[PDB]
Amino acid sequence: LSPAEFFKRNPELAGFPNPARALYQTVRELIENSLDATDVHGILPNIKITIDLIDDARQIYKVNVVDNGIGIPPQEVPNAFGRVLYSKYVNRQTRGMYGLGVKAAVLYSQMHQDKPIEIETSPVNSKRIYTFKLKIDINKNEPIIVERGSVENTRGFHGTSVAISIPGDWPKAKSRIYEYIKRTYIITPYAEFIFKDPEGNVTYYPRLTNKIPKPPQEVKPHPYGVDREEIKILINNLKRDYTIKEFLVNEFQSIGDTTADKILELAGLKPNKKVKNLTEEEITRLVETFKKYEDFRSPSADSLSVIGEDLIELGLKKIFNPDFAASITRKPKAYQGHPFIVEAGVAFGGSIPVGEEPIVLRYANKIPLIYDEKSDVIWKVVEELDWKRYGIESDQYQMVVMVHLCSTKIPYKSAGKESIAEVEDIEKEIKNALMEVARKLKQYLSEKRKEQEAKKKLLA
Ligand SMILES: [Ca+2]
Ligand SMILES: [Ca+2]
Fold it and tell me: For binding ATP, which residues are annotated in this chain's numbering?
């Protein structure tokens, strides 16, 4: 089965089990693309989100997201929204759990209602705004251009507007849609959002800074990460006729002149042989060799993008108005051929609510994880930590804890659930990060208690 057909038969595994989740997911897919279209390219995101009830009785909602991003070349629009791929190795951090991305919303839209999706886009420095009304052919997995136009652009405008009409359920999805937006804002203080909901409520999320974290850079795949099927994709993807040596050193990370030489012998392949002429045994051998070689450099972290200690603290402070906040961005680690970094943050006191458990905010590649929190490896680590060792004395406290995992391979427990898996190496690092911030909080609490006792005992 193709991704598209599998989606249609198993929507509940792709984030679309019912209209409420469909509505929530469509909103996230659009906001996520708009962020990746802006901040990754050095643009402060100005994002507008509107949801309108367009058919009361059948509960169809129109979701519109507008950004000031880099836009999309006109010739790329149809496929970007209306052609699902038959299978991409990730070499750059991107926002989103689901492989189909916005295409899942498009499919769902075309499967349950009749309006086309509406797109208006203008690439940087384009003299035109290009308009489209499109559908995806639900049987052929191909774009249908219903309408294609263009209008004159204005000075310095660039960006994209996307409108998709879908079955939805606002009352059910409402709280989690707001929470999604709120949590996105917390770690994206350099973005400005406007949200108008179907009831006509408007919420404004002002830009708090103009500092944008460093962008992800595409990297070549690291050998520990590739499967045969992946190799014979980089192979049939070459424009030149490389030699096997020519190919290990130019299409992979951490393979230099000398390392390739070794790999070649280990795998019993000849440098001079041309890669296109490999065999299902020469390959098997390469992969097994890859999996068994112990002298590779760790997967480069250039492909990752952190929120940053400053931005995490800025967001926690501005949104929660705590007495104290702290954060840590850990040094990169790696697992199964992919780099990963954990960042963590804590906010304590102030206007934050009293309760018997901390508020736990989970992020993966800069995206909120909203559902399935109790099965997530982050919840597990937070619950297992004994906060009394860190200065928390009462069984009721006011604390927010945040954890961000970024990687080119986030391990999820199950398709259609937003919970990160308990991979040992990742769990270990999440615990190390939380402890680092928990110790900053312990120091805060100990200094505060000392100041209080001093005033009580020494001041009149
Ligand atoms: Ca995405
Ligand atoms: Ca505990």
Answer: 33, 67, 87-88, 97-103, 417
Q: Residue 97 annotated as binding?
A: yes
Which tokens is 202 given?
């408007």
The DSSP H or E segment spanning 111 is helix 102-112
How many angstroms is it from 74 CA to the middle of ligand 2? 53
In angstroms, the Cα distances linking 110 to 16, 132, 356, 447 are 14, 15, 45, 60
Cα of 394 to ligand 2 centre, how many Å?
13
Ligand nearest to the CA of 410: 1
137 is in an annotated binding site: no
- CA–centroid distance, 395 to ligand 1, in Å, is 40
Residue 40: nearest ligand to its CA? Answer: 1
439 C-alpha to ligand 2 centroid (Å): 15
* Distance in angstroms between the alpha carbons of the first and the last residue of the chain: 78
**CATH superfamily name and code, 1-210:** Histidine kinase-like ATPase, C-terminal domain (3.30.565.10)
- Give the residue extent of every domain in the chain: 1-210, 220-297, 305-460
Cross-strand pairs, 151 = 129
Q: Is 417 annotated as a binding residue?
A: yes
Determine the distance separating the centroid of ligand 1 and the alpha carbon of 69, expressed in angstroms: 15
Do 63 and 166 touch, CB atoms closer than 8 A? yes
> 119: which DSSP letter?
E
Dihedrals phi, psi of 238, to nearest 5 degrees? -75, 145
DSSP lists the bridge partners of residue 122 as 159
> Resolution limit in angstroms?
2.0
> Is 102 annotated as ligand-binding?
yes
Architecture of domain 220-297: Orthogonal Bundle (1.10)
33 has binding-site annotation:
yes
How much distance in Å is there from the Cα of 382 to the middle of ligand 2?
7
305-460 CATH: 3.30.230.10
Angle subtended at Cα 18 by Cα 17 and Cα 20, rounded to the nearest 5 degrees: 125
CA distances to 63, 64, 102, 352 from 15, in Å: 16, 19, 11, 31
96 Cα: distance to centroid of ligand 1 (angstroms): 4
